[PDB]
Curated annotation (Swiss-Prot):
It is an enzyme of class 2 (transferase). This is Thiosulfate sulfurtransferase. Substrate binds at R186, K249. The keyword GTP-binding does not apply. GO terms for cellular component: mitochondrial matrix; mitochondrion. Monomer. Expressed in numerous tissues.
């Protein structure tokens, strides 16, 4: 049971203006959750090299159950809190996270919802990213941020998350809308999955393509409420009934929720594992592609 939606999109000027104010504190907290592939770019290095005044880095690699056989999962209730709190974040601080990839969004959402799952209201994303931050030409730094650690109480919410048992009960149920931001080539089964061995490209019977790229503009700014609600319907996708989304590692999925979230439906959960768990966990016969199969 939900009601009033919280502000999930922040602007360059807003935080910028909140900086000079020195509002940044146990109150408001901005972090940079950005991650590009092996060889591509080293963000760890990039952040400490150039980042938002009083921002902290968010290691997507150490904010997860480094125990699971599979790519990036939601830590334990105890795990999370200790991290978030590790970097002076309380249950009352608003959280502004983001990535710095040309797009503007990709891994941000990943983290955004994350916070959402652990029942935490105040948590909005940055419309424009570091892309437009540095384009807008706003202050930056190469100075350590060492907040005064705090206590973050975490309570996992079963609504925003559906596991591989439910997702499988659905394939037969036929009551939960299944989206996948994996992207057409991936979704379609035409393009192979980077950084894999014996991994097969394809999709889950019922899967409808809704690439996360289409949800953002070339300017690297999010589309509007209007357009968002038209692309969805354009694809005979109803945001009125329960919805669930996949992708590769359930990162770009949360993009569909910021998407749905903004059209007025926090309700949308996520099959965290994505097509990765599926392909491995589940019988072939319940996932389809073209190239072989």
């Amino acid at each position: 049971v939900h009601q009033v939606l919280y502000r999930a999109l922040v602007s360059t000027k807003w935080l910028a203006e909140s900086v000079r104010a020195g509002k940044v504190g146990p109150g408001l907290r901005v972090l940079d959750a950005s991650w590009y592939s092996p060889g591509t770019r080293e963000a760890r290095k990039e952040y400490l090299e150039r980042h938002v005044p009083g921002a902290s880095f968010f290691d997507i690699e150490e904010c997860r159950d480094k125990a699971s056989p599979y790519e990036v999962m939601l830590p334990s209730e105890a795990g999370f809190a200790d991290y978030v709190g590790s970097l002076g974040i309380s249950n009352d601080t608003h959280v502004v996270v983001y990535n710095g990839d040309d797009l503007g969004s990709f891994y941000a959402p990943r983290v955004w919802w994350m916070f959402r799952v652990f029942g935490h209201r105040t948590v909005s994303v940055l419309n424009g990213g570091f892309r437009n931050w540095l384009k807008e030409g706003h202050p930056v730094t190469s100075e350590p941020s060492r907040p005064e650690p705090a206590i973050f109480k975490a309570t996992l919410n079963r609504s925003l998350l559906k596991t591989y048992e439910q997702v499988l009960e659905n394939l037969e149920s036929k009551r939960f809308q299944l989206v996948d931001s994996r992207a057409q080539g991936r979704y379609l089964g035409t393009q192979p999955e980077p950084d894999a061995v014996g991994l097969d490209s394809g999709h889950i019977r019922g899967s409808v393509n809704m690439p996360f790229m289409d949800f953002l503009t070339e300017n690297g700014f999010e589309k509007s409420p209007e357009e968002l609600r038209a692309m969805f319907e354009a694809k005979k996708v109803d945001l009125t009934k329960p919805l669930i989304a996949t992708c590769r590692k359930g990162v770009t999925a949360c993009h569909i929720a910021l998407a749905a979230y903004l059209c007025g439906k926090p309700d949308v959960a996520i099959y965290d594992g994505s097509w990765f768990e599926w392909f491995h966990r589940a019988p072939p016969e319940t996932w389809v592609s073209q190239g072989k199969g």
